[PDB]
């Protein structure tokens, strides 16, 4: 639709998932953002699932 709910699984496995929204036509490609992952305890990149 636009700004739907999207999930960022921790690239470093861990199944750490952040959620947020984005405009799926402003950014049709998958979102990539570097975020803190609790179990690893480090700032690893996160990829849209």
């Amino acid at each position: 639709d636009v700004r739907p709910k999207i999930t960022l699984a921790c690239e470093v496995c861990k199944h750490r998932n952040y959620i947020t929204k984005k405009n799926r036509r402003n950014d049709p490609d998958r979102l990539e953002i570097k975020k803190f992952c609790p179990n690893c305890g480090t700032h690893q990149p996160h990829k849209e699932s």
């Binding site: 959620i19 947020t20 929204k21």
Partner: protein, 63 residues
């Protein structure tokens, strides 16, 4: 006839060591995207039952 206790109240309320009645806070099942983590943190855990509802919950639990 022995009294029958309320099933839902038994599933929703607890008693602590000194007899305090303790419940869980609502608004924490779904729709947790737009909710900030501070809101979900203040909604986490258990609180004691308010004084207004104490008599009703005690009645629903004991019998």
């Amino acid at each position: 006839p022995k009294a029958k206790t309320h099933s839902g109240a038994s599933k929703r309320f607890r008693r602590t060591g000194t007899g305090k009645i303790v419940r869980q806070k609502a608004n924490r099942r779904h729709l947790l995207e737009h909710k900030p983590t501070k809101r979900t943190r203040r909604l986490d855990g258990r609180t004691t039952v308010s004084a207004a509802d104490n008599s009703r919950i005690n009645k629903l639990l004991n019998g």
